[PDB]
Design a protein that fits this description.
part of a larger assembly; 7 chains; A alpha+beta (about 250); B mainly alpha (about 15); C alpha+beta (about 230); E mainly alpha (about 60); F alpha+beta (about 625); B: mainly alpha; F: 6-stranded mixed β-sheet; 6-stranded mixed β-barrel; 9 helices; 33 strands; binds magnesium ion; binds zinc ion; RNA-binding; EC 2.7.7.6 (chain F); nucleotidyltransferase (chain F); ribonucleoside binding (chain F); DNA binding (chain F); DNA-directed RNA polymerase activity (chain F)
RNA sequence: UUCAAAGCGGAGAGGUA
């Protein structure tokens, strides 16, 4: 809050003159100097929708300068999103950053439309992605989605859809690493899979229930599929439900 | 050379 | 001294209910206390009704398929386990189903007594096709939380009545968040936003009231004695 | 930018899977959904790495229990070598080679044992979990914590025949600390001095190629180069599909099985078409390039092709020279630049039987890099030896060195031969 | 009105364009024209900033 | 600098025991500045020497005046290291012994060695000798820790380490701030500024103590007494101590409870999460004193007078002046406050102008000294000056978000969050932690010694013991450090009576709960006592901003510098980055309107204030300056 | 339903106090919610009393010294700040100290009115030599939490008063643990054990009662308003 | 009617990322 009141002074003065009719520029400057409570109320609405450019010292490629939208914080340090550190090559052990603001309409529109940090997915040297979970998020995903021979309370329980399994895990009744059967009509991709069908039981009425290592497809006589079940883990259900919910919403 | 004088560079949004 | 307001209030695809509340102004750190204490009680300590036992006629053993029905025992048992019912009595009831003909069987076909009401009147249970008869019998009980039987899976055959793992939860999901409402240069002020998802048996305002009623009586006896 | 349902990934999720998922989301849904998905994954990982309680201790640093016997065997071999040297049987340039090779092979065996021990006893070990998942660790760093530091080098390029046989868990001695400080200082000064060279190179690159801006749409040519995979003889290093993405074809390609066309003239190649070309044979594809385009003092839009940051054809008035210079110059500071071990292959017979070599292969007496004498072979011949129950079908290679001659008794896992796996003879 | 909605709208404007550097100029021209025409002392929805207003209007015209 | 190359910055085998191989700078000065080792000394020719003990028939003669030898002398001898073990300070044990012969490492039978080094720490310097469990650390992190130990700040109440190394009392006796009694007598008068000790009929000894002085880097230099009146005192006993020493020995940091685990993203990539107890308990607070100066000179127009009759100022801004124009001792001064009032005789009625000195923006504190000097009083002054006034201002600083913290083993960090004490994780007895550190930073950098230090500090706190461990401690056993730490922890568990202190399944780990929900974490974590330091890099001295200020005279570009409202430089690498984006309007606005377009600056500012559009720029002034300079050639 | 009783009580050499309470029977998971709510309210939301300002005769800043006294002003302000004191009236009170000659000034030398009382009359405050005197005035106040000095209290009425950062925390440690108290059939009942350490200003029973009364007033507005 | 009194260049040494 101590840098914004200095970098954004002319816009604050203009807003003070137009709304909350003050008088002249000298009175506005005296009001800023006196630290009136109205100053921060004006500044908060001055800075919304105004991008700002952030830069780090050895600019080695074009992703060393990027545009963000500012939020007023209390303290004397700049807060940086963890997902942009590898692009800046930043690190929180003493690094410093520089801040510039654009003034005219063309500069603002151009910073919003060409430099904003949420449209910099790929790298220009090679088309590989550049914003991926890196250090402590990959460890959490690995722990959540791994397997555990011990601590397997509630194994072998049947659930209908993924939300039921998540609700049963949230209130403690199954482990995070247990093996459970869930009902899921979709596309599956298992590791260590047996692509050849197994345990084909030709039941009555021409209904065939093929049992694989990780699926229990049940098919009608020379026809389509009737049902499918997947043997999985509650952590995997959590991971995949999170991804699907993010994509569909 | 347009940077030295202070003109619009002939690349990007200043192309035309 | 704080105020609580109901921001949004929707209704899902004919069954569920959604509610969001804002509570403010609180001290610093009281938002987490109130939110977690409400979450635990809402999710784990409210009573409800569920289907516990079911009997199906004509099971055709050595497999699990029922003649003339597209589904098998496991599918029907998972379908009937999600039925949402609401009872006005503390005593268990009994319901019957004797559909027939080439139709789609829904929750509207169950002939419960006057003391039990079905929330969703169209809940898919099965599809009877051209010459099959479906006989069912359901038992309803009272309880709390997620239950679980011991040494008994779902696709099996037990004596007469088959037991199930009931979901007595009336509340499906609860979320909470704490935001800043400082307004000035003074002591920090909290604001709590709480979202409740319900299965339709209760409105998301009776659940909050019941949780508060159960929480007040836990802390009251620790005040006037010790 | 919709309609593509995600697949249910029923597997463990390391860093490679996350990168694959991000790439798939960008390719199918756009640039504003990828940000949302990445934020959700970040929140989930931060939440569930705290509930686990991952920590680090001293007992988490597990050393295999067979280290002592391995070191004892290596030291017995070293004593045999030095006793041979003292009696004049071998020269000085052979003792050094023998003692270097022994300690170069012992370290590989110990590393194998360490890695095998981690994955069997405690597969949820904190060090193993955080190094195998791709979060921060390595294998040259896990080696020095629970294994063995190995052979180091002088302040010059020479090699000290005294190895470091302790980890950071057990603790170095006064003598090993100095030998480590040598390399520490070398790395520090290297890092200090590389930055100026990298910066000067990048500045020269930027000034040579600043005026390359895209002004034209098409020069209308028929020239280009031939793109093929980058292979080191038997092995390939870069496949053709990775080298053919975003390019524009200068001639229609054809499947080498029939007359089915896969691309016409002047067509950019996406990932699907690159995979289709790679799978169906084909070793060379002729493409356009900035090397061969005849425009007015620049490149055109068709000869350049895709812009890799957007996965689209380049726009008009784009400064490609600055981008090329920055891309070449950015990884400049990452250019951070023991003898024959498993790069050869010893052949040990796990049988006990008499020798039936006779005089079939060309056995010329030879003195190997150590002090031993063996027979050098250049004629590829299938070894014939009476191996107890049944004979031998072993195959030698050109330039091999066989130790076993006729009239010998081979035992279980006794050294039988040496085969070079697939040239500068210095002085 | 959310920032995420603005991000999605800007992405949609970038597509259907055939040139990335030609849409920024159009947005800037529209924003300047809107702010200048606002000079009438009526304050027609002065809450929104001119660039976001131009983005919203051009997205609505996209149908 | 341009002529020194790879060969001069290396380590030579002749530096052994004479120059430290660890302590150097990083960057352009790496290998060009070095530090003398612990036992080395320079003879009268100018060559560095080092001591050795003689070995006769495999017996170390530790009673025969060690000999000092230069690099060339000890090339024909077989010299053994200082970590070899003897049985009764006599015969060397073992069958093979490492030796150095002609700058090479070999091994010989112990009847053929000639000399033995004095101590195992003979090879390192004094700063590196203060790191316990050093042989379990990498060399780069050892360099970092040794360098960072010399940037710590003296705290309000210092405290000794629990896992010191044994050299602390010797590193503090050379600064000359600790007072020891030469008497062996009694103490008769104790005061905050004076101590007196009386012998056994041997007159009196009196000492005066410095109080709240100032160092070159604006840090306090206090001195405090330890003893009470009527105390029996022996010779060589500490009587008073300085601002950075506990009783006798150095004390640069504090012992705090630490746990190794990740928080909800606040530990990410070297960030530090601390508790609120470290703020209201006055841990990690320090005193900084600054000095301001004003000069009254004489001019051809006339002399300058120091007085309180300043023009264009109201009585609301002259409260704390002493009717002579100088502020009073004990006043609280905020930013933009007058300290000394001065008027200059301008030429133009009233002909005086006001340029009195005021505190710079961002400074506050108490006035503690106003010493002043003048002529006609015996004081020497620079020519043409009448009087000099010096003012000293002090303040107390607390730890806050953005400050740098460090440990002795090379682990740096920046504080990112300060949690209330009910949110921190707590122990099976209810005690909340003080600091949470990320375990991702240990295995990729190989600081294994910090875990040893934490566990031994935990045992020492539970026993009240204050252990001391010397570096390279494995010459006595196969794994000495682990065995000592395990034995100490087991003894603490048996003495205390609490079984949760130490567990045999996971030795260094105990159970920890969540302060927000009350649920325990899935697996036990490592907790201990760590000795952490606060560095001189504070965020109050690194934040700067500018809108418009002074401009350069020749080029008319903004000035540079924090102390003169300076601007940030936009180099050419940033210009390249903006060119690669396709940006044309941001670049042109940066180059002209915001730097040196002398007429477009005012137009842009007025257009922004009035709410109109910013007009087109012109030609910047530096191009015209260059054209004039080229024409002049 | 459910009873609370006290098992142990003690008193230390600093006149602190300790207490252990046993609350039972709870209902399968209600131990943790109750315990954590109590621990969070007790350690954060209680009102106490502290010394907020002090005037010493002869000094005007904190970096001074008094002749004949073994401690400087900064080392006396850090001893006065830790003086635990309990006021009955809801007003600021002023206490007076005047010592002379060779002595050790101790908290027993501070004499407040008939309302405020000292808890530990052995607190150490400075040491005196022969011929040196100490004169002090202390001001006590009510509050909660940790209050920092703001340099805006420039009122001329309070002239030459040195201000301190105030700490009002009457409870210094809380612990709790939930045990299984299964009667024997299947009922799976709980029992909570809670330990409280105070500084002597108030008994652990009074602190527990105050926390339980704050929680009820926190959860009562939600009981039927929603 | 006027503004207006606070800004200055170079050299050396050390440090942070
Ligand atoms: Mg860094
Ligand atoms: Zn071309």
């Amino acid at each position: 809050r101590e840098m914004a009141i200095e970098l954004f002074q002319p816009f604050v003065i203009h807003r003070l003159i137009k709304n909350h009719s003050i008088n002249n520029i000298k009175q506005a400057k005296k009001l800023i100097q006196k630290n009136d409570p109205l100053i921060w109320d004006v500044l908060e609405e001055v800075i919304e929708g105004h991008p700002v450019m952030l830069n780090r010292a050895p600019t080695l490629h074009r992703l060393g300068i990027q545009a963000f939208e500012p939020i007023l914080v209390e303290g004397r340090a700049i807060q940086l999103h963890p997902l942009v550190c590898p692009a800046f090559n930043a690190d929180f052990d003493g690094d410093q950053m520089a801040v510039h603001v654009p003034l005219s309409i063309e500069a603002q529109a151009e910073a919003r439309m060409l430099m904003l940090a949420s449209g910099n997915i790929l790298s220009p040297a090679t088309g590989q992605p550049i914003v991926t979970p890196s250090q402590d998020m990959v460890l959490g995903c690995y722990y959540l989605t791994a397997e555990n021979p011990g601590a397997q309370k509630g194994a072998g329980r049947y659930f209908a859809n993924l939300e039921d399994a998540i609700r049963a895990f949230e209130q403690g009744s199954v482990d995070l690493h247990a093996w459970v059967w869930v009902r899921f009509d979709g596309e599956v991709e298992s590791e260590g899979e047996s692509d050849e069908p197994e345990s084909v039981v030709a039941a009555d009425d021409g209904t065939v229930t093929k049992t694989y290592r990780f699926r229990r497809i049940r098919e009608t006589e020379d026809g389509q599929r009737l049902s499918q079940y997947v043997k999985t883990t509650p952590g995997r259900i959590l991971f995949n439900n999170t991804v699907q919910t993010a994509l569909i919403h | 050379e347009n940077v030295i004088i202070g003109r619009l560079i002939p690349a990007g949004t200043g192309f035309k | 001294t704080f105020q609580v307001e109901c921001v949004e209030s929707r209704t899902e695809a004919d069954q569920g209910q959604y509610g969001r509340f804002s509570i403010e102004p609180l001290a610093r750190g009281q938002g987490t206390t109130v939110g977690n204490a409400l979450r635990r009680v809402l999710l784990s300590n409210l009573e409800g009704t569920a289907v516990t036992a079911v009997r199906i006629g004509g099971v055709n053993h050595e497999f699990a398929t029922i003649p003339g029905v597209r589904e098998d025992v496991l599918d029907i048992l998972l379908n009937v386990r999600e039925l949402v019912v609401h009872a006005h009595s503390p005593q268990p009831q009994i319901g019957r189903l004797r559909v027939v003909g080439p139709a789609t069987v829904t929750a509207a076909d169950v002939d419960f007594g006057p003391e039990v009401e079905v929330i969703n009147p169209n809940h898919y249970i099965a599809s009877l096709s051209e010459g099959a008869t479906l006989e069912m019998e359901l038992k309803v009980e009272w309880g709390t939380g997620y239950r679980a039987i011991d040494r008994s899976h779902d696709e099996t055959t037990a004596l007469d009545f088959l037991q199930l793992d009931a979901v007595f939860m009336p509340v499906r999901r609860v979320n909470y968040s704490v935001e800043d409402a400082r307004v000035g240069e003074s002591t920090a002020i909290d604001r709590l936003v709480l979202e409740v998802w319900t299965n339709g048996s209760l409105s998301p305002q009776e659940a909050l009231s019941q949780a508060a009623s159960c929480l007040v009586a836990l802390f009251e006896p620790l005040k006037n004695v010790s | 930018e919709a309609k593509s349902a995600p697949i249910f990934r029923n597997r463990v999720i390391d860093k490679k899977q996350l990168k694959k998922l991000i790439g798939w989301t960008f390719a199918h849904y756009g640039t504003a959904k990828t940000a949302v998905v990445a934020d959700d994954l970040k929140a989930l990982g931060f939440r569930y790495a705290t509930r686990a309680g991952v920590s680090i201790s001293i007992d988490d640093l597990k050393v295999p229990g067979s280290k002592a016997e391995l070191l004892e065997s290596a030291e017995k071999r070293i004593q045999e070598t030095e006793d041979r040297y003292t009696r004049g049987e071998i020269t000085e340039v052979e003792r050094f080679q023998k003692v270097i090779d022994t300690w170069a092979n012992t370290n590989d065996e110990l590393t194998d044992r360490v890695v095998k021990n981690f994955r069997e006893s405690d597969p949820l070990n904190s060090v193993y979990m955080m190094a195998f998942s791709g979060a921060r660790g390595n294998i040259s760093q896990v080696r020095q914590l629970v294994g063995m530091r190995g052979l180091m080098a002088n302040p010059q390029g020479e090699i000290i025949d005294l190895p470091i046989k302790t980890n950071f868990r057990e603790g170095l001695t006064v003598t090993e600390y100095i030998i480590s400080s040598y390399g520490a200082r070398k790395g520090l000064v290297d890092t200090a001095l590389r930055t100026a060279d990298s910066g000067y190179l990048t500045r020269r690159l930027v000034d040579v190629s600043q005026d390359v801006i895209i002004h034209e749409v098409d020069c209308g040519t028929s020239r280009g180069l031939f793109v093929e995979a980058m292979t080191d003889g038997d092995r390939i290093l870069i496949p053709i599909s990775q080298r053919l993405l975003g390019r524009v074809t200068a001639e229609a390609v054809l499947d080498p099985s029939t007359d089915e066309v896969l691309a016409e003239a002047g067509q950019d190649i996406n990932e699907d078409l690159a995979n289709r070309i790679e799978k169906a044979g084909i070793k060379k594809v002729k493409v356009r390039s900035p090397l061969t385009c005849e425009a007015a003092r620049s490149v055109c839009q068709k000869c350049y092709g895709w812009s890799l940051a957007h996965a689209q054809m380049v726009d008009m008035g784009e400064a490609v020279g600055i981008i090329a210079a920055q891309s070449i110059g950015e990884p400049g500071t990452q250019l951070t630049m023991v003898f024959t071990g498993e790069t050869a292959r010893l052949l040990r017979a796990p049988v006990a039987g008499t020798i039936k070599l006779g005089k079939k292969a060309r056995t010329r007496p030879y003195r190997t890099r150590h002090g031993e004498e063996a027979l050098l072979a250049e004629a590829n011949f299938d070894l014939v030896l009476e191996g107890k129950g049944r004979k031998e079908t072993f195959a030698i290679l050109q330039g091999s060195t066989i130790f076993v001659q006729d009239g010998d008794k081979v035992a279980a896992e006794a050294i039988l031969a040496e085969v070079p796996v697939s040239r500068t003879v210095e002085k | 009105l959310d920032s995420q909605d603005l991000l999605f709208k800007a992405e949609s404007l970038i597509v259907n364009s055939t040139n990335r550097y030609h849409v920024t100029l159009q947005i800037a021209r529209r924003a300047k024209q809107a702010r200048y025409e606002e000079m009438e002392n009526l304050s027609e929805e002065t809450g929104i900033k001119p660039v976001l207003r131009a983005i919203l209007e051009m997205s609505d015209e996209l149908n | 600098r341009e002529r020194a190359g790879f060969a001069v910055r290396d380590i030579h085998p002749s530096h052994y025991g004479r120059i430290c191989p660890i302590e150097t700078p990083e960057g352009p000065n790496a290998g060009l500045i070095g530090s003398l080792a612990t036992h080395a000394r320079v003879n009268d020719y100018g060559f560095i020497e080092t001591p050795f003990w003689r070995v006769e028939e495999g017996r170390v003669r530790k009673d025969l005046a060690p000999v000092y030898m230069t690099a060339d002398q000890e090339d024909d001898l077989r010299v053994a290291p200082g970590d070899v073990a003897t049985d009764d300070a006599g015969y060397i044990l073992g069958t093979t012994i490492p030796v150095r012969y002609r700058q090479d490492f070999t091994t010989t039978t112990p009847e053929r060695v000639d000399y033995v080094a004095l101590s195992p720490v003979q090879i390192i310097s004094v700063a590196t000798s203060l790191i316990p469990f050093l042989e379990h650390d990498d060399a780069n992190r050892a360099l970092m820790g040794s360098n960072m130990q010399r940037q710590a700040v003296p705290l309000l109440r210092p405290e000794r380490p629990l896992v010191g190394t044994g050299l602390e009392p010797q590193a503090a006796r050379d600064s000359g701030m600790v007072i020891t009694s030469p008497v062996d007598g009694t103490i008769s008068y104790v005061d905050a500024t004076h101590i007196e000790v009386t012998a056994d009929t041997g007159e009196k000894y009196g000492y005066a103590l410095q109080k709240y002085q100032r160092s070159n880097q604006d840090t306090c230099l206090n001195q405090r007494p330890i003893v009470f009146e009527g105390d029996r005192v022996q010779r060589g006993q500490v009587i008073a101590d300085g601002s950075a020493t506990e009783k006798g020995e150095l004390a640069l940091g504090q012992n705090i409870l630490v746990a190794y685990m990740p928080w909800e993203g606040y530990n990410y990539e070297d960030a530090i999460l601390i508790s609120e107890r470290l703020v209201y308990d006055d841990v990690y607070t320090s005193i900084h004193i600054e000095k301001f100066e004003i000069e009254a000179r004489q001019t051809k127009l006339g002399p300058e007078e120091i007085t309180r009759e300043i023009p264009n100022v109201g009585e609301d801004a002259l409260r704390q002046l002493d009717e002579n124009g100088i502020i009073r001792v004990g006043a609280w001064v905020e930013s933009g406050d007058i300290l000394v009032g001065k008027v200059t005789p301008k030429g133009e009625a009233r002909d005086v102008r006001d340029n009195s000195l005021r505190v710079p923006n961002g400074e506050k504190g108490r006035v503690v000294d106003v010493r002043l000097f003048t002529r006609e009083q015996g004081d020497e002054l620079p020519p043409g000056a009448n009087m000099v006034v010096r003012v000293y201002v002090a303040q107390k600083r607390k730890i806050q978000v953005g400050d740098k913290m460090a440990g002795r083993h090379g682990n740096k960090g920046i504080i990112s969050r300060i949690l209330p004490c009910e949110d921190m994780p707590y122990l099976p007895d209810g005690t909340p932690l003080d600091i949470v550190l990320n375990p991702l930073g240990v295995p990729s950098r190989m600081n294994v010694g910090q875990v040893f230090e934490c566990m031994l500090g935990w045992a020492g706190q539970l026993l009240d013991a204050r252990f001391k461990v010397t570096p390279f401690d494995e010459m006595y056993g196969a794994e000495a450090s682990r065995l000592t730490v395990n034995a100490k922890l087991s003894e603490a568990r048996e003495q205390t009576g609490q079984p949760w202190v130490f567990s045999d399944d996971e030795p260094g780990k105990i159970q920890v709960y969540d302060g927000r929900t009350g649920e325990p974490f899935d697996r036990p974590v490592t907790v201990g006592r760590a000795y952490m330091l606060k560095l001189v890099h504070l965020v109050d001295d690194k934040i700067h901003a500018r809108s418009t200020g002074p401009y350069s005279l020749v080029t008319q570009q903004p000035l540079g510098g924090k102390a003169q409202q300076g601007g940030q430089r936009f180099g050419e690498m940033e210009v390249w980055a903006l060119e690669a984006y396709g940006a044309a309007y941001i670049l042109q606005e940066l180059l002209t309107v915001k730097s040196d377009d002398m007429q477009g600056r005012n137009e842009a500012l007025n257009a922004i204030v009035k709410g109109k559009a910013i007009p087109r720029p012109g030609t910047p002034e530096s191009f015209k300056v260059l054209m004039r300079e080229l024409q002049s050639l």
